[PDB]
């Protein structure tokens, strides 16, 4: 009389311990493999007053290639994987499977654009903890990579027609979420630290900062972005500034596949049937969610 059933499971990519674990790991890797020559951070006392802490340490310049990694299940635990089409990242999952480790990941610290991540299987998918809340970041997962090549020459190359198509398809998806009649518009960052305002990322150990204005000025050949390599930066790991050594060889290069984006929607009390979206990012945890959203670890019961 007993009946066979698939173990259903509810997921929440926005409250997934794995994302925090990864965050702490990348920070570990950096703290041990990419140390700044000088680090400035606020040193405070419970009262609220702060002073700048200064850390000077050996900062060997290392040319690094991406080391693929993955997260695996410890004894007594299991990693569940949601296999549903267009999975929202939240709620019950119909087709679930189990795995020993997650897929191979080539983590990348960056803003605005997600580089070298996983592509969506079907069409472009967009996810947010709550679309109605404009303060919640929108994670865009592309189904087609747009190659972006940079050179120490001070600029990165991006196919224009390719990116134009991308913006349109993303717009379409946003319309599927907010209304087929609303007008979709992309605008540059409203501002903030350089890291937040530009499309920044670390490639081969160097810190790139690119003007992404061209990238997000759209209405519903090559696109050359003015980029720059910086030695003095604001840290993503914690509040503070860091200084690293200058580039070695010279004529720095980088080739990456734009596989996602982090967007923000302008709070709109203004009734006009139009939605505006700008480049987002900053908290690197959203970068980790883009890769870990379909996994959930559970106790073997």
């Amino acid at each position: 009389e007993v009946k066979l059933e698939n173990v259903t499971e509810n997921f929440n990519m926005w409250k997934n311990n794995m994302v925090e674990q990864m965050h702490e790991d990348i920070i570990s890797l950096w703290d041990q493999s990419l140390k700044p020559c000088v680090k400035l951070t606020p040193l405070c006392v419970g009262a609220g007053s702060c002073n700048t802490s200064v850390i000077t340490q050996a900062c060997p310049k290392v040319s690094f290639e991406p080391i693929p990694i993955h997260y695996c299940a410890p004894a007594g635990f299991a990693i569940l994987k949601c296999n549903d089409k267009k999975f929202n990242g939240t709620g019950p999952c119909t087709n679930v499977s189990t795995v020993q480790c997650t897929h191979g990941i080539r983590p990348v610290v960056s803003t605005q654009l997600l580089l070298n991540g996983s592509l969506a299987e079907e069409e472009i998918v967009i996810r947010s903890e709550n679309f109605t809340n404009n303060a919640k970041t929108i994670i865009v997962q592309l189904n087609e990579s747009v190659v972006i090549n940079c050179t120490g020459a001070g600029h990165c190359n991006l196919s224009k027609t390719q990116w134009e198509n991308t913006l349109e398809q993303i717009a379409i998806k946003l319309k599927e979420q907010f209304g087929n009649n609303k007008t979709i518009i992309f605008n540059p960052s409203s501002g903030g630290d350089p890291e937040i305002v530009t499309h920044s990322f670390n490639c081969g150990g160097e810190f790139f900062y690119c003007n992404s204005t061209q990238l997000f000025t759209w209405n519903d050949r090559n696109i050359t972005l003015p980029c720059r390599i910086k030695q003095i930066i604001n840290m993503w790991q914690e509040v503070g500034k860091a200084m690293y050594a200058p580039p070695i060889r010279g004529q720095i290069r980088c080739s990456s596949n734009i596989t996602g984006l982090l967007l923000t929607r302008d709070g709109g009390k203004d009734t006009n049937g139009t939605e505006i979206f700008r480049p987002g990012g900053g908290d690197m945890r959203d970068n980790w969610r883009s890769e870990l959203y379909k996994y959930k670890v559970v106790k073997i019961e």
Partner: antibody, heavy 128, light 110 residues
């Protein structure tokens, strides 16, 4: 392509402190890092410390344990050197020097340790 | 920490002749090695940095050479203005504890 001009000679009493000034002109102040060097009479050069102007962070020679402080005033393109609890053997000529680091205001920095531009030096005599 | 040693302490050379100055680090300093010239009553003047790069304004007779812990300053043809004291300086360690050699005085042989 600058000019470093230092303050006048000083006569100090043992146990007191001195503050030598160095005014920089000719280019963007924050694009330079400045160093202080001392030369006791008849001796060689001795590195005392260097300040990364844009970061307002200074590093020092170990043997000047907490007695030396190098500061910069971006408002007046002036660098200062303070040496406390002076001893007669602190007597010497103090040189201010500097080198271009690049577009520091844009986040670029060579972090050069050599010294291209030099002040004229300031003699400090410590004696009772 | 890192000790810079220069030799000879004093070098006597006839004007017009060549001169080779030596500087040794107590350990590798890669190429962060500079050479300075100083006349009495004057401020040091930069000659070479990066072990082999001549500073702007310095005559071509001044050439730097070497890497690691062995460096050399050569002056192909000594002129009246070259007779002075020469100092090498390493600036490769970090945290920074830069250091100078105790100098080599170049004197006129007569």
């Amino acid at each position: 392509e600058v000019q470093l001009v230092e303050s006048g000679a000083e006569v100090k009493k043992p146990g007191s402190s001195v503050k030598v000034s160095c005014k920089a002109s000719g280019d963007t102040f924050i694009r330079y890092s400045f160093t202080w060097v001392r030369q006791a009479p008849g001796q060689g050069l001795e590195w005392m410390g260097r300040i990364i102007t844009i970061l307002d962070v200074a590093h020092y020679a170990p043997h000047l344990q907490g007695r030396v402080t190098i500061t910069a005033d971006k408002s007046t393109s002036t660098v200062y050197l303070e040496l406390r609890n002076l001893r007669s053997d602190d007597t010497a000529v103090y040189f201010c020097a500097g080198v271009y680091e690049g577009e520091a205001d844009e986040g670029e920095y060579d972090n050069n340790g050599f010294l291209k531009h030099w002040g004229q030096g300031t003699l400090v005599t410590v004696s009772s | 920490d890192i000790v810079m040693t220069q030799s000879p302490a004093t070098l006597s050379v006839s004007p017009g002749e060549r001169a080779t100055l030596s500087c040794r680090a107590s350990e590798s300093v890669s190429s962060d090695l500079a050479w300075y010239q100083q006349k009495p009553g004057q401020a040091p003047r930069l000659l070479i940095y990066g072990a082999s790069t001549r500073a702007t304004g310095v005559p071509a007779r001044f050439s730097g050479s070497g890497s690691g812990a062995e460096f050399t300053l050569t002056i192909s043809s000594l002129q009246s203005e070259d007779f002075a004291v020469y100092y090498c300086q390493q600036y490769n360690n970090w945290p920074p504890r830069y250091t100078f050699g105790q100098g080599t005085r170049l004197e006129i042989k007569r």
